[PDB]
Amino acid sequence: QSPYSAAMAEQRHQEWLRFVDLLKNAYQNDLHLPLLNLMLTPDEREALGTRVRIVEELLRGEMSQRELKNELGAGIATITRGSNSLKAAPVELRQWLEEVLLKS
């Protein structure tokens, strides 16, 4: 095959990759912090923490939803997905997380 510089995707996947590309290639050494602040920092530090923290919070023991709206985080949907995530989330996740989840 001979793709000419990939293609112009319709959805957001190019600029996206930029933020990533540096983020990853950086952690290799230690610039990921200064880079993180370059293309990721506002709703990011807020909403991104949340999601990886609400899911890793209840998907660790058994449950935990009666924590009442934490407002600063959400309190409506994103808080109750971590549960149904069993299906909601992709399937290729159980393939790896079996290991990144029980290992912790």
Add this chain to the structure above:
Amino acid sequence: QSPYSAAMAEQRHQEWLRFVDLLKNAYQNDLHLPLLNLMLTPDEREALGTRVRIVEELLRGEMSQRELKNELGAGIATITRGSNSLKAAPVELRQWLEEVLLKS
């Protein structure tokens, strides 16, 4: 009125590391995409294409006239650090970016 105005203070570094640490270990297997849609997906997918449009354009897109504050499409705030992204940038980055900017 009182909430979300000037009380900015949230030294996050835990849930944060999850989003990161999780990715780093995944990019190896190559499933960081399905995971991204997890630790990042809403204001993230957007606010990201943003900081990237500005940063990336500031380098080879010098032409930045049909962008100056299109108001609802970026944030007038975004385009401010973008003027100081110059001085205030980290130094040792000049030694790495040679590689993360020219090559990719």
